[PDB]
Ligand binder design. Structure first.
Ligand SMILES: Nc1nc(Cl)cc(N(Cc2cccs2)C2CC2)n1
Ligand SMILES: [Cl-]
Length: 461
């Protein structure tokens, strides 16, 4: 069976949630379901990101980084897929996966997902990034009601999953130490407590898995086979050796038109064999504009949806003018954030002045969108790693680096304003009184930030 059609290559960049969705063209589009979520990332990775920027890598740092990252993350991906999970999105060295199931099957699926989690940790027992540095992962699990949001215009589409289970998995995974599997409170509440031995996490209702101790007669393979009854797209029969059913997709121009809207044009160029397959793995100077949209505690998905949509419509128009791309969209703890990048495949130009002007335009517009409580934007400029991360069958373009993290922390630690780093401030074709030098905050994962500035804008008022 020939499988290497463009439609199949596009499907590598998307979950089954999207590939096999069959939803309307209205934007926003929302749907509601239940599932179990897994959030996982890799320890010692930042350490490596640093190693690969240095001269010892002889101009092949981005190539070597992408290789070693994909070596590890593709193993995680394969575990997830063989356990029946759907990888939703990647961000750097992190990924979110979903096992969508009927409410009645949540108990047994939690068991599957815990076993998957333990098998993931098992890959990394004894593993080192390099001699002297271990590679381990941290896992959070959650379960419950999940909403999906699809937003976009006639040319581009984005999706998010939303709700308390989504917030829960992020919180769980944040409490995890290397080697941990943390369960959300609701996940512990819904699980097969007869089989899962936990310990309390101090000052938290979330719990830590110590062991899976199944009954004497339990057989995991048989249990798993029964669970597959409820997995609509588990590869089976003649396709039992495939990691994904999506590998069997056949040409279908209406489906392909829908799916391509989720994928960046430079990626589609590679997929169409009009660009070299290695061209997107690079350490390149970019400017990151990280936009955070905060909603109220009580806001439901049905009001968040339209507001994201409205914000998006303006974001995309401004980025187009200023030559920027949306690299990734995230949502947790009532903040929807857009990781925007100026300068990447082909787009290099007063990149700084424009990133700042774009940020102010976004800030001013979004601040007026109904339901958006606070807009915050962090702007940082520097060398970042760009590349397609994941497995051959399930991968995405992503950006990794200290300036990405810096922009992300700025937007959270300095809410309600537009902030920029020192590179941006100094490089800009703009006068000093357009800025305000800020108090320096101690920020998680942040270096010495260097001086940080608010972009005040062109007038006092
Ligand atoms: N809300 C949301 N949706 C998706 Cl599909 C992904 C995503 N993020 C951020 C989150 C991580 C954990 C819970 S939400 C993944 C890509 C890092 N956030
Ligand atoms: Cl870096």
């Amino acid at each position: 069976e020939f499988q290497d059609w463009p439609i199949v290559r596009i499907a590598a960049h998307l979950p089954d949630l999207i590939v096999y969705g069959h939803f309307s063209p209205e934007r926003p589009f929302m749907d509601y379901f239940d599932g179990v979520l897994m959030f996982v990332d890799i320890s010692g990775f930042t350490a490596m990101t640093e190693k690969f920027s240095s001269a010892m890598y002889m101009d092949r740092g981005a190539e070597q980084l992408v290789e070693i990252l994909n070596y590890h993350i593709s193993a995680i991906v394969e575990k997830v897929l063989i356990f029946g999970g759907d990888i939703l999105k990647f961000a750097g060295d992190a990924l979110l996966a979903l096992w969508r199931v009927e409410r009645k099957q949540l108990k047994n699926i939690i068991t599957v997902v815990i076993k998957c989690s333990l098998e993931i940790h098992g890959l990394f027992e004894t593993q080192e990034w390099e001699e002297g540095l271990d590679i381990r992962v941290k896992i959070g699990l959650a379960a419950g009601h999940i909403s999906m949001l699809v937003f976009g215009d006639e040319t581009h589409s984005h999706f998010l999953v939303i709700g308390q289970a989504v917030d829960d998995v992020r919180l769980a995974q944040n409490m995890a130490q290397m080697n941990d599997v943390i369960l959300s409170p609701n996940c512990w509440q819904l699980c097969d407590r007869s089989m899962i031995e936990i310990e309390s996490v101090p000052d938290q209702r979330a719990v830590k898995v110590n062991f899976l101790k199944p009954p004497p007669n339990f057989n995991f393979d048989e249990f798993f086979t029964k669970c597959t009854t409820f997995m609509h797209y588990y590869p089976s029969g003649e396709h039992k050796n495939l990691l994904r059913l999506a590998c069997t997709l056949k040409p279908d121009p209406e489906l392909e038109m829908s799916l391509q809207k989720y994928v960046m044009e430079s990626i589609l160029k590679q997929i169409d064999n009009k660009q070299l397959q290695g061209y997107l793995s690079e350490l390149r100077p970019v400017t990151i504009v990280f936009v955070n949209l905060m909603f109220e505690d009580q806001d439901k998905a049905e009001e968040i949806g339209p507001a994201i949509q409205d914000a998006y419509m303006h974001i995309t128009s401004v980025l187009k003018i200023f030559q920027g791309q949306i690299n990734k969209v995230f949502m947790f703890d009532k903040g929807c954030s857009f990781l925007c990048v100026f300068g990447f495949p082909g787009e290099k130009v007063d990149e700084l002045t424009h990133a700042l002007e774009c940020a102010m335009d976004i800030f001013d517009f979004c601040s007026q969108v109904h339901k958006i409580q606070t807009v915050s934007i962090g702007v940082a400029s520097g060398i970042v790693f760009c590349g397609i991360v994941g497995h051959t069958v399930r991968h995405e373009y992503t950006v990794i680096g200290q300036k990405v993290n810096l922009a992300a922390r700025m937007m959270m630690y300095y809410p309600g304003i537009v902030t920029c780093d020192s590179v941006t401030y100094n490089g800009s074709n703009l006068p000093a009184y357009f800025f305000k030098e800020l108090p320096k905050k101690v920020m998680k994962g942040v270096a010495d930030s260097g001086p940080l500035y608010q972009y005040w804008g062109r007038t006092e008022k």
